Amino acid sequence: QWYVCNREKLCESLQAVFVQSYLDQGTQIFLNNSIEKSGWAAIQAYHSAVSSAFSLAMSRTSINGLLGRGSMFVFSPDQFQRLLKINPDWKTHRLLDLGAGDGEVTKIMSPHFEEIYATELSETMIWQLQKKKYRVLGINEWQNTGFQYDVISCLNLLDRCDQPLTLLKDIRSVLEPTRGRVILALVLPFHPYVENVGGKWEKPSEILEIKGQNWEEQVNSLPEVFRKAGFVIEAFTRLPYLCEGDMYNDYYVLDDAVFVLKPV
Amino acid sequence: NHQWYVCNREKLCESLQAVFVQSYLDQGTQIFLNNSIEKSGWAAIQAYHSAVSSAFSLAMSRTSINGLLGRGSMFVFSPDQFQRLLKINPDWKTHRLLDLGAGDGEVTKIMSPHFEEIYATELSETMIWQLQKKKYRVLGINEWQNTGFQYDVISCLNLLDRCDQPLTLLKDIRSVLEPTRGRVILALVLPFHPYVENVGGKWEKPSEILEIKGQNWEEQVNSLPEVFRKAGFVIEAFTRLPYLCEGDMYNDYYVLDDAVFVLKPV
């Protein structure tokens, strides 16, 4: 359901790089953990109470990290080791996770790096990222650290930032050019906005030319977009952008398209 | 009352002795003290503030907690004290103001009537909300020098001892200050003990250190003209003011020893 697509509708060159995912162990563990967390009605009431009172003074993201709630899921360890095509014990030097959220998505990729680096707009997410021992860098500081990153993860951020196309060329410049790989998640249908305080939002200062009338077409528009910033798709899959749920629903799902981009 | 305002003028640099303004516990300062004493009797809220801070101390910075609740509003000078320090009349006005590290903007509100456009910066996410509620224009920490404009007045009120690059901030102020008539309003907590606030009662030493060598309030101010001269500033007027803040369940107000300086570019 979340993992399949009409392989005919894809572009012929995308047909050769697609990877099939399945509802495996780790996804069930997350789903079963989420169903358990929602079952605790006392927490949900406390969560749905704190967020309601401070929603005007903070962002929906910052409140989540303040509570450690609403953690999300993209790929399982095996799902990640099948898209990147790495063995369970694969390991390189540096990771960079841009807009890493509360880090429960970065923690899946963490066993493969000696150094993890993360950026986040939310002040409580930075605290959550430092709680995972990650070196949290500024949003304009990572491109100037004086060293390159072997894997730069940009998961579900282009539809959430002000200058996404700038971020793409930024990643291209600091990615280790010989063997570095970029992993990039994206919610389709592509609906971008910049989150603001008090449930508000603003349109981004850079428009991405990601168009389509379904999942397969919006994916087909992405190869040329990655070609702009100097990337080519090495592999990609369809995954659910799973998120922890409230008292109303045990979990939430969004349609994610993850890409492994080698620099060209 | 008195110990908040007096300095040993004989222990001052004889160039600072000329430009020292004597301020006093005036009406505007007592408007703050009476209110802080009032809001300390509100035990209903004083336990509410104590509840939220105890809950979110590990997840946010103490400043961000104060911003979310809007509590802990601080005080430096009154409008009269502010007018007397800038050598300006009550109805005086100009175009641009920039308050670097403005907090919840309760000290900016003292200066705000004198300006047509008020810019300010902050690191705390909740403090920026408190500033935009006052309709101020919140700029990034590295945008205010690169917008191109020069601010007629730039205020760095006790940001030096709390930021990572203080001397860089001094340099950045000199570049984008209106050179013909622009003044700089500087506050600084003495004894100078700097750090950079992090989340959860932790901290980190600033990347830069300022040459503030002094032992009493007067001696630390003695070495300041050198530091300001390094940034292209001379001291036009300065004073000793109590750096106040709204109290709590146990105390009505918290006081610090502020040395406030009005500077002009040299």
Add this chain to the structure above:
Amino acid sequence: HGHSHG
């Protein structure tokens, strides 16, 4: 109470 992505 919503999905934590908007």
Add this chain to the structure above:
Amino acid sequence: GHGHSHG
């Protein structure tokens, strides 16, 4: 019991 907002 409660800090001076500055610190």
